[PDB]
């Protein structure tokens, strides 16, 4: 894709902190950029649509390569069009703004380069306000093994780059992306039957994904997802796997992950409105990526979680599922959880924590987003899923929401002013970001 010129691009600023020891942090002057897929795609000459609703113009885009040459990703009016604002260390993402739904943003090191985090033997903390996230919404903060430059050095017809939010990948091998690897996705494009703005093409973009935070005011999950190749790679067709291929298990990434949602793990009192972590008020989420020998070059062995609210430091609750022990993600936990829930162990099939850790060693990009779910209504996060199962069977119940909740047309109509706000990002050695 070309770099658009109809609307100017300026990346909202966002501060965050690097910590060297508890209480000892310094400020980084970051910025964020909107993902390419939210942008208007305009022909470079006439400033007319290359993509309208969910179909492509056949003159500008007769094939994938020609489309990338003829079409540009426009700049973004972050607040006015996308409902994205920032102030200090805070980033607020609104749900519905005009015809726009949600957003996905990346943290930048500079105007052409995503910030790369090396998570092994480190800790990441942030504050979040999920009080205005009802059933069906997901404010997600997570890491993916994107290229720092958004693909530009590999793909000459990507002239837009990280400056325009190119290069996304995740463990779903997303095929909804209009541009992957310097080519459009017009060949094989199939408009979504239930989303006027989206479709699915033949190409998908795979990479490992560390879902630090997928949450609303009802439930949260922390979930690593390994891929056979840790970093970004293109897939084609059904063999992409992931949620929007015919068979989610046909590809090279684990679409399910090894998840810890305290409600799903048998403690419904822990997280939610008025609960031990009270989602009606902001709180701090700390995540630690421990290695087997406690050094930077060890193998990822354990992912731990702490919350801080009202200055009280609260560990993740223990699993209360028979057969599944502890409050952290480890190989043993993950093997046991899949067995107890009767879920296929795709996590182990794609290399588990060893392959997640390899992706972490490659470096990962921070993503902050807000979305609703045109495949499964977020029921996997906050309801009983699948909806035909007995909610008392271990693994089925994930939150309090009814099984008819989360339909996009309902939540976009009923909760347009919902939002998520992320703030006070801190990163550093284990125990450096909070009072351990
Ligand atoms: C859902 O998960 C939450 C979070 O883990 C869990 O709440 C925790 O419950 C335990 C047990 O009630 C609490 O631990 C006790 O806390 C009191 C007050 O601080 C202490 O006095 C207790 O100390 C005694 O017992 C300890 C062993 O448990 C001994 O080591 C100690 O020497 C004392 O004899 C004990 O630590 C804990 O504080 C809460 N945590 C929070 C944040 O509320 C809850 O039970 C889970 N709910 C369900 C339904 O499963
Ligand atoms: C990070 O801080 C934690 C909490 O103070 C340390 O873990 C405690 O370590 C002691 C000594 O082994 C144990 O007796 C406690 O049971 C631990 N508590 C918890 C909550 O795990 C931990 O060692 C620190 N990590 C590093 C690398 O310094
Ligand atoms: O595709 C929706 C959602 O699935 C999540 O995995 C589910 C899985 O679909 C379900 O079969 C299993 O029982 O539970 C897991 C965990 O909720 C996956 O984690 C999400 O990334 C994905 O968006």
Q: Which two tokens stand for residue 436?
A: 């351990």
Residue of 261, 317, 326 to mutate, ligand 1, most atoms within 8 A of C-beta: 317
- Alpha-helix runs per DSSP H in 152-231: none
Q: Which two tokens stand for residue 234?
A: 């293109």
- The CA-atom distances, in angstroms, between 207 and each of 362, 373, 407 are 11, 20, 28
Q: Measured in angstroms, how far is the CA atom of residue 317 from the centroid of ligand 1?
A: 10
* DSSP code per residue over 225-251: E-BSSSS-EEEEGGGG-STTSS-TTSS
CB atoms within 10 A of CB 359: 27
- Give the distance from CA 410 to its chain's centroid: 23
| 372 Cβ closer than 6 Å to some ligand 3 atom | no
DSSP symbol at 38: G
Q: Where are the beta strands (DSSP E) in 130-254?
A: 137-144, 179-180, 183-184, 190-191, 199-200, 203-206, 209-215, 220-225, 233-236
Residue (of 223, 229, 221) closest to 303 by Cα position? 223
Taken as a whole, the chain contains a residue count of 436
Question: What residue owns the CA closest to ligand 3's atom 19?
Answer: 256
DSSP symbol at 198: -
Q: Is 360 exposed, middle or buried (0-12, 13-18, 19+ CB in 10 A)?
A: buried
Q: Residue 260 in contact with residue 222, Cβ under 8 Å? A: yes
- Give the distance from CA 293 to its chain's centroid: 29
| 269 Cβ closer than 6 Å to some ligand 1 atom | yes
- Nearest ligand 3 atom to the CA of 223 is 19
Its domain, for residue 186, covers 2-436
> Which residues have C-beta within 8 Å of that of residue 413, sequence separation ≥ 6?
none
Q: What is the experimental resolution, given in Å to one decimal place? A: 1.3
CA-to-CA distance for 252 and 286, rounded, in angstroms? 29
> Which residues have C-beta within 8 Å of that of residue 433, sequence separation ≥ 6?
19, 22, 25, 123, 124, 125, 286, 426, 427
CA-to-CA distance for 143 and 168, rounded, in angstroms? 11
CB atoms within 10 A of CB 273: 13
Supply φ then ψ for residue 332, to 5 degrees: -60, -45
| 430 Cβ closer than 6 Å to some ligand 3 atom | no
CB atoms within 10 A of CB 69: 16
- List the beta bridge partners of residue 49: 42
CA-to-CA distance for 243 and 210, rounded, in angstroms? 17
> Which residues have C-beta within 8 Å of that of residue 31, sequence separation ≥ 6?
11, 12, 13, 14, 107, 108, 111
| 320 Cβ closer than 6 Å to some ligand 1 atom | yes
CA-based R_g, the chain, Å: 20
Q: Is 288 exposed, middle or buried (0-12, 13-18, 19+ CB in 10 A)?
A: buried
> Which residues have C-beta within 8 Å of that of residue 51, sequence separation ≥ 6?
41, 57, 61, 71, 178
Helix (H, G, I), strand (E, B) or coil at 37: helix
Helix (H) and strand (E) counts in the chain: 7, 31
Deposited experimental method? X-ray
* Sign, CA torsion 220/341/408/227: positive
Give the catalytic positions in this structure. 209, 214
| 174 Cβ closer than 6 Å to some ligand 3 atom | no
Q: Residue 303 in contact with residue 224, Cβ under 8 Å? A: yes
Q: Measured in angstroms, how far is the CA atom of residue 381 from the centroid of ligand 1?
A: 26
| Total tally of structural domains belonging to the chain | 1
Question: What residue owns the CA closest to ligand 2's atom 5?
Answer: 436
- Nearest ligand 3 atom to the CA of 381 is 17
| 431 Cβ closer than 6 Å to some ligand 2 atom | yes
Looking only at the bridges linking them, the beta strands covering 199-200 and 190-191 are antiparallel
Q: Residue 363 in contact with residue 118, Cβ under 8 Å? A: yes
Q: 230-269 in b/e burial notation, b at 16+ Cβ within 10 A?
A: bbbbbbeeeebbbbbbeebebbbbbbbbbbbbbbbbbbbe
> CA 143, 394, 241: angle at the middle one, nearest 5?
45
Q: Is 113 exposed, middle or buried (0-12, 13-18, 19+ CB in 10 A)?
A: middle
Q: Measured in angstroms, how far is the CA atom of residue 50 from the centroid of ligand 3?
A: 34
Q: Which two tokens stand for residue 283?
A: 């709180």
The beta-carbon contacts of 331-340 under 8 Å, at least 24 apart in sequence, are 331/301, 333/258, 333/260, 334/258, 337/258, 337/259, 337/265, 338/258, 340/394, 340/395
| 239 Cβ closer than 6 Å to some ligand 3 atom | no
Question: What residue owns the CA closest to ligand 1's atom 7?
Answer: 317
Helix (H, G, I), strand (E, B) or coil at 124: strand
CA-to-CA distance for 21 and 309, rounded, in angstroms? 21
Q: Measured in angstroms, how far is the CA atom of residue 436 from the centroid of ligand 2?
A: 8
Q: Residue 357 in contact with residue 344, Cβ under 8 Å? A: no
Q: Is 21 exposed, middle or buried (0-12, 13-18, 19+ CB in 10 A)?
A: exposed
| 430 Cβ closer than 6 Å to some ligand 2 atom | yes
- The CA-atom distances, in angstroms, between 376 and each of 167, 249, 261, 393, 405 are 25, 16, 17, 19, 10
Q: Residue 287 in contact with residue 303, Cβ under 8 Å? A: yes
Q: Is 403 exposed, middle or buried (0-12, 13-18, 19+ CB in 10 A)?
A: middle
Q: Measured in angstroms, how far is the CA atom of residue 379 from the centroid of ligand 3?
A: 9
CA-to-CA distance for 371 and 146, rounded, in angstroms? 20
- Nearest ligand 3 atom to the CA of 341 is 13
Q: Measured in angstroms, how far is the CA atom of residue 214 from the centroid of ligand 2?
A: 27
CA-to-CA distance for 330 and 223, rounded, in angstroms? 11
CA-to-CA distance for 67 and 158, rounded, in angstroms? 11
Specify the CATH number for the domain of residue 380. 2.70.100.10
| 3 Cβ closer than 6 Å to some ligand 1 atom | no
Ligand nearest to the CA of 277: 1
């Amino acid at each position: 894709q070309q770099a658009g010129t109809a609307t100017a691009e300026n990346h909202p600023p966002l501060t965050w902190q690097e910590c060297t020891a508890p209480g000892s942090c310094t400020t980084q002057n970051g910025a964020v950029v909107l993902d390419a897929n939210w942008r208007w795609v305009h022909d470079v000459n006439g400033y007319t649509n290359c993509y309208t609703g969910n179909t492509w113009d056949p003159t500008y885009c007769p094939d994938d390569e020609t489309c990338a040459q003829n079409c540009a990703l426009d700049g973004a009016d972050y607040e006015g069009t996308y409902g994205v604002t920032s102030s200090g260390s805070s980033l607020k993402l609104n749900f519905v703004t005009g015809s726009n739904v949600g957003s996905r943003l990346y943290l930048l090191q500079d105007d052409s380069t995503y910030q790369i985090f090396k998570l092994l033997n480190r800790e990441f903390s942030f504050d979040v306000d999920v009080s205005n996230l009802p059933c069906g919404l997901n404010g997600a903060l997570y890491f993916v093994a994107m290229d720092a430059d958004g693909g530009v050095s590999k793909y000459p017809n990507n002239k837009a780059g990280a400056k325009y939010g190119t290069g996304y990948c995740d463990s779903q091998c997303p095929r909804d992306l209009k541009f992957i690897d310097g080519e459009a996705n017009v060949e094989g494009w199939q408009p979504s039957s239930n989303n006027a703005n989206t479709g699915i093409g033949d190409h998908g973009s795979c990479c490992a994904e560390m879902d630090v935070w997928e949450a609303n005011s009802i439930s949260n999950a922390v979930t690593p997802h390994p891929c056979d190749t840790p970093g970004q790679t293109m897939c084609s067709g059904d063999d992409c796997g992931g949620t929007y291929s015919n068979d989610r298990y046909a590809g090279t990434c684990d679409p399910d992950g090894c998840d810890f949602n305290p409600y799903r793990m048998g403690n419904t009192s822990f997280y939610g409105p008025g609960k031990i972590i009270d989602t009606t008020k902001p709180f701090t989420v700390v995540t630690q990526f421990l290695t087997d020998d406690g050094t930077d070059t060890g193998t990822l062995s354990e992912i731990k979680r702490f919350y801080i609210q009202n200055s009280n430091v609260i560990p993740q609750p223990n699993s209360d599922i028979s057969g599944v022990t502890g409050n952290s993600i480890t190989t043993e936990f993950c093997t046991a959880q899949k067995q107890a829930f009767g879920d296929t162990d795709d996590f182990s099939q794609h290399g588990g924590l060893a392959k997640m850790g390899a992706a972490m060693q490659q470096g990962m990009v921070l993503v902050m987003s807000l979305w609703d779910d045109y495949a499964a209504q977020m029921l996997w996060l906050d309801s009983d899923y699948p909806t035909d199962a007995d909610p008392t069977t271990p693994g089925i119940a994930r939150g309090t929401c009814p099984t008819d909740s989360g339909v996009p047309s309902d939540v976009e109509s009923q909760s347009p002013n919902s939002y998520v706000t992320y703030s006070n990002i801190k990163f550093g050695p284990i125990n450096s970001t909070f009072t351990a």
